[PDB]
Design a protein around this ligand. Structure first.
Ligand code: 3UY
Ligand code: NI
Length: 393
């Protein structure tokens, strides 16, 4: 899959994007790769943060679906007009497909100044698509219209400008050059988000000793569209307490632990060893088994070059509190080659050939761990009448 290696780019903290073409003749656009959403949506009107947008009028193959879409979320919203057109990935499979495209006509706090992307490729399942699950997501269309296997994999590699990032999205397979050691699989619990189950959390070898349902309250997901490792409130508090304790020789402001303030050391003197490793044990394919993925401070402390002190190495704490469950974001994913094996309803992890580490410690994927009479660690989200009233024909 040499053609697909190194096809992702971006700016630190602002998402990874892949080059895509839309329409006939092909219009090139940079598209955010988001395993936490399910719409293909592209800027389709002028915006201050867009250098370019999808021009429906220039495409002979564009078809209007005569239906709008409105997508509010926590920070803001995007909206626009649904249609279809021909889509390809120049540094992807040698195929062209007709996909749904949401042409974004108005948005608030969606595009990011300087991120260099103009659209989003939602790689999650139909269940969370907008306006509803009958709007076929891009990957579903790709699989149905071509002979591309139902699997993709992601290798995310982590003074005036933000640091550039790179990576690979391999569509249709697994590229063995992108990982080392064993590839371990955890079940996709349900096909909506890429939902998984965490059965144990350790911070420098020490068990947090919480009821494991707390780790997955109210879900745990693998999400390329979130920068941070996000943890449920109770888990976040317990983790921060443990990381604080391990690093106690350094007294950081409260701002740092809230992710609102950088901490610096003189260039190349960062005391990595005072910061603990974090292990998440994921449910194995075998009932009573688990495997652990272990990340370093190199993953959870994000580099940000401060203009005022460009001679310092400065870091943001990239673990944050959630009210919507665990989010294994770029912080987690940058340690690993991550295989989204939709065909077999499972997610694979292996140590990334590009992960950042030091001479003492490495990101690791290790197993099996077996537990006698393993409890159910999954949480069942309370069913609303709204959700229950939906017919799924
Ligand atoms: C797609 C949605 C709209 C619908 C709700 O979800 C949104 C979200 C948030 O989490 C995920 N996974 N996608 C999302 C993330 C980023 C982003 C911002 C910074 C870095 N990386 C990014 F993906 C930008 C836009 C955006 O919009
Ligand atoms: Ni009905």
């Amino acid at each position: 899959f040499v053609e697909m290696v190194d096809n992702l780019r971006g700016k630190s903290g602002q998402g990874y994007y892949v080059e895509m073409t839309v329409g006939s003749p092909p219009q090139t656009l940079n598209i955010l790769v988001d395993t936490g959403s399910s719409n293909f949506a592209v800027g389709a009107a002028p915006h201050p943060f867009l250098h370019r947008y999808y021009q429906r009028q220039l495409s002979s193959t564009y078809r209007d679906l005569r239906k709008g879409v409105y997508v509010p979320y926590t920070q803001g919203k995007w909206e626009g007009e649904l249609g279809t057109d021909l889509v390809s990935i120049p540094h992807g499979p040698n195929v062209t497909v007709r996909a749904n495209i949401a042409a974004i006509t108005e948005s608030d706090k969606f595009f990011i100044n300087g991120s260099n992307w103009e659209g989003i490729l939602g790689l999650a399942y139909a269940e969370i698509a907008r306006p509803d699950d009958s709007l076929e997501p891009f990957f579903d269309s790709l699989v149905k219209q071509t002979h591309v296997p139902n699997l993709f994999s992601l290798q995310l590699c982590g003074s005036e400008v933000l640091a550039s990032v790179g990576g690979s999205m391999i569509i249709g397979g697994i590229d063995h050059s992108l990982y080392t050691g064993s590839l371990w699989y955890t079940p996709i619990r349900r096909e909506w988000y890429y939902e998984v189950i965490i059965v144990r959390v350790e911070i420098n070898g020490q068990d947090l000793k919480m009821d494991c349902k707390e780790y997955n309250y109210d879900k745990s997901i693998v999400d390329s569209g979130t920068t941070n490792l996000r943890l449920p409130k109770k888990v976040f508090e317990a983790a921060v307490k443990s990381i604080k304790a391990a690093s106690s020789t350094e007294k950081f402001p409260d701002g740092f632990w809230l992710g609102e303030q950088l901490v610096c050391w003189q260039a190349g003197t960062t005391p990595w060893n005072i910061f603990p490793v974090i292990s998440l044990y994921l449910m194995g394919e075998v009932t009573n088994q688990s495997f652990r993925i272990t990340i370093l401070p190199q993953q959870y402390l994000r580099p940000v070059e401060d203009v005022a002190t460009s001679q310092d190495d400065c870091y943001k704490f990239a673990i944050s509190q959630s009210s919507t469950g665990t989010v294994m974001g770029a912080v987690i994913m940058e340690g690993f080659y991550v295989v989204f094996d939709r065909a077999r309803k499972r997610i694979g992890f292996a140590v990334s050939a590009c992960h950042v580490h030091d001479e003492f410690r490495t990101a690791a994927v290790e197993g099996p761990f077996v537990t006698l009479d393993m409890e159910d660690c999954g949480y069942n989200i309370p069913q609303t009448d709204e959700s229950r009233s939906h017919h799924h024909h």
